[PDB]
């Protein structure tokens, strides 16, 4: 339930 | 025998690199006037007023989007394909396509300028979505992206004709899976004999890991302000880094390829079209 990520979340 | 920018230029003109794959980010869209956060923008930048974001990235997160989608659609109005024109970096990539040297152009951007410049969809992987399509967040009915254009540009939230739910452009938010078309990298990067990295700090996964997928003998050329990502902390002997201004860096490579005359003509032919 996720994949796209950037330094923070 | 480490490679320089000129050597890479020699490998294209010598046709030793015929399957060029390209990774691009916001760095190649800044010259076109496109707003960015980590580097303030216009007055619409600080339009957060009235909008109590917990942090700027919440603009691309569903939980807050459900709470208040207007911040996103304020940005969507600005970045909607039509208000900005491609720059020299975009046309350098079509010129690469017109010479049959481009395998794919992987992009983190959603400004749609890659296709405005002339690259066909078959040669693009819009890894972080597009405004070309939309989806109702309630009943999950898909729509063509232009069915909501008038609503966005009129500062009114687009509603679903079936359930009146909020219609969301198919933009990948944080915590969302990337479009399955992103899986073409499993075949494209091994097939590549050259990798170009243009204007990105490689801070967004799983897009940044793509720098690892090319075979161990493939040159990786980085035209960027900073030395970032694996080309910084996991270098390969065949890597090259033209550090500096992305436009100046692309101008340099174009200069070394002897394509200047053809770039001038292509940009003039593309800007004249109304
Ligand atoms: C996935 O990363 C899609 C990103 C599209 C980002 C366009 C951002 C423009 C900047 C304006 C304010 C938004 C907050 C910053 C988020 C990194
Ligand atoms: Zn609906």
């Amino acid at each position: 339930t996720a994949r796209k990520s950037t330094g923070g979340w | 025998g480490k490679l320089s920018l000129q050597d890479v230029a020699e490998l294209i003109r010598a046709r030793a690199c015929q399957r060029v794959v390209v990774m691009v980010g916001a760095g190649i869209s800044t010259p076109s006037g496109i707003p960015d956060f980590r580097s303030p923008g216009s007055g619409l930048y600080s339009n957060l007023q009235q909008y109590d974001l917990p942090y700027p990235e919440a603009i691309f997160e569903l939980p807050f989007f459900f709470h208040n989608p207007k911040p996103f659609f304020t940005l969507a109005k600005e970045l909607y394909p039509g208000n900005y024109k491609p720059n020299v970096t975009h046309y350098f990539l079509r010129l690469l396509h017109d010479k049959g040297l481009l395998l794919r152009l992987y992009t983190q951007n959603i400004d749609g300028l890659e296709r405005v410049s002339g690259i066909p969809a078959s040669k693009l992987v819009e890894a972080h979505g597009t405004f070309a399509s939309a989806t109702c967040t309630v009943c999950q009915r898909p729509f063509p992206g232009e069915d909501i254009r008038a609503d966005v540009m009129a500062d009114r939230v687009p509603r679903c004709p079936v359930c009146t739910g909020v219609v969301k452009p198919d933009i990948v938010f944080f915590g969302e899976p990337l479009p399955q078309r992103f899986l073409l990298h499993v075949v494209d990067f091994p097939m590549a004999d050259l990798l170009l990295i243009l204007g990105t700090s490689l801070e967004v996964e799983p897009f940044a890991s793509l720098t690892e997928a090319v075979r161990s003998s493939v040159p990786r050329l980085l035209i960027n302000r900073d030395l970032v990502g694996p080309l910084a902390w996991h270098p390969r002997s065949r890597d090259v880094a033209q550090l500096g201004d992305v436009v100046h860096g692309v101008e340099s490579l174009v200069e070394l390829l002897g394509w200047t005359e053809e770039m001038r003509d292509l940009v003039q032919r593309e800007t004249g079209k109304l």
Side-chain angles (χ1 to χ4, degrees), chain B residues 150-170:
Chain B
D151 292 346
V152 174
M153 286 298 175
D155 291 337
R156 56 179 181 265
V157 175
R159 296 284 173 180
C160 176
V162 176
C163 74
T164 71
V166 174
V167 182
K168 171 181 165 291
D170 291 348

Side-chain angles (χ1 to χ4, degrees), chain B residues 2 12 36 61 66 83 98 105 108 119 128 147-148 150 157 197 210 220 242 267 273:
Chain B
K2 289 166 287 300
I12 287 89
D36 184 17
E61 291 185 352
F66 298 157
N83 189 30
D98 296 344
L105 174 53
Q108 295 180 327
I119 290 88
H128 293 163
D147 283 351
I148 61 169
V157 175
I197 301 168
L210 289 174
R220 302 187 301 176
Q242 183 59 55
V267 177
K273 300 176 180 182

Side-chain angles (χ1 to χ4, degrees), chain B residues 111-189:
Chain B
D111 53 37
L113 290 179
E114 285 84 6
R115 283 197 284 266
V116 172
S117 64
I119 290 88
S122 61
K123 303 294 290 185
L124 277 165
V125 177
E126 293 170 330
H128 293 163
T130 179
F131 296 100
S133 58
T135 299
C136 177
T137 60
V138 177
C139 73
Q140 294 299 319
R141 174 163 286 93
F143 298 96
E146 68 276 8
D147 283 351
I148 61 169
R149 181 180 184 285
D151 292 346
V152 174
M153 286 298 175
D155 291 337
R156 56 179 181 265
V157 175
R159 296 284 173 180
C160 176
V162 176
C163 74
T164 71
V166 174
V167 182
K168 171 181 165 291
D170 291 348
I171 302 299
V172 178
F173 285 0
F174 303 105
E176 290 181 348
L178 276 64
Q180 296 298 88
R181 183 169 173 79
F182 176 80
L183 296 172
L184 289 173
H185 78 273
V186 179
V187 56
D188 292 333
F189 281 45

Side-chain angles (χ1 to χ4, degrees), chain B residues 211-263:
Chain B
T211 61
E212 300 291 335
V214 296
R215 289 173 292 104
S216 60
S217 60
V218 171
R220 302 187 301 176
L221 176 57
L222 175 66
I223 298 170
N224 192 42
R225 298 282 287 183
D226 298 334
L227 184 67
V228 296
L231 281 78
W233 41 262
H234 199 346
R236 296 178 183 178
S237 68
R238 198 165 275 271
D239 295 347
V240 179
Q242 183 59 55
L243 298 179
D245 187 74
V246 297
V247 172
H248 186 272
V250 173
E251 288 290 337
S252 299
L253 178 60
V254 169
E255 194 67 16
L256 296 168
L257 295 173
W259 296 357
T260 306
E261 185 66 10
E262 296 179 356
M263 281 291 290

